């Protein structure tokens, strides 16, 4: 795998979104890995619905929490609609897939990256965007305005985000807070620290969509 990977340069990531006051990070996270693998595989970049995952994933908890592996599984099983046809409302409501007609895309499966293993994650990111969790509660993470973030942060993961690249000393992450947070909505987290947890617990649980 190469020294630098940046899926935005390959035209495989859409504009940064803002989840607002809904704890829908898990759905935002799962959707940037669906947008990236559809572009990688079909050549077309499209935006997909976070609201659909929020309303329809019965294992997750709507606003206040969920699982991007559960969200990723629904799309393999069923599929997902364009963001346009099912726009973000920031509130969980009834599942409306049926009403919005046929799915725009569908996936074939969900895989997990071997945890607490930096090289395993970096090999998955070299192939497609990956869903990743981290501890985002400390005000150092919240007030991030740029640079390679080294912490301080613990490993009490609470925020799902997506990794879309890496470099020699960092992993590149798409967050769902505004384009005004961090580096136009992105954060480069220090890697190669020797901590198996990863900085802020970044190697705790990472999943990616399989599309054939």
């Amino acid at each position: 795998i190469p020294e630098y990977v940046d899926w935005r340069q390959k035209g495989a990531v859409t504009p940064v979104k803002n989840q607002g006051s809904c704890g829908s990070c898990w759905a935002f996270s799962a959707v940037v890995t669906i947008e990236g693998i559809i572009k990688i595989r079909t050549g077309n970049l499209n935006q997909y619905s976070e609201q659909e995952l929020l309303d329809c994933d019965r294992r997750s908890y709507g606003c206040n929490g969920g699982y991007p592996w559960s969200a990723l599984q629904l799309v393999a099983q069923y599929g997902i609609h364009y963001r346009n046809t099912y726009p973000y409302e920031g509130v969980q409501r009834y599942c409306r897939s049926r009403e919005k007609g046929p799915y725009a895309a569908k996936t074939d499966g969900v895989r997990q990256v071997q945890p607490y293993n930096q090289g395993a994650l970096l090999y998955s990111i070299a192939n497609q965007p990956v869903s990743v969790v981290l501890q985002a509660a400390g005000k150092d993470f919240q007030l991030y305005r740029g640079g390679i973030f080294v912490g301080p942060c613990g490993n009490k993961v609470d925020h799902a985000v997506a990794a879309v690249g890496y470099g020699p000393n960092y992993i590149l992450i798409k967050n769902s807070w505004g384009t005004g947070w961090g580096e136009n909505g992105y954060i480069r987290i220090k890697r190669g620290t020797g901590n198996s947890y990863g900085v802020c617990g970044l190697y705790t649980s990472s999943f990616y969509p399989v599309k054939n």
């Binding site: 990070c25 898990w26 929490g65 501890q135 009490k156 993961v157 609470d158």
Partner: peptide, 5 residues
């Protein structure tokens, strides 16, 4: 304190 969301 801090866990899934």
């Amino acid at each position: 304190q801090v866990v899934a969301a």
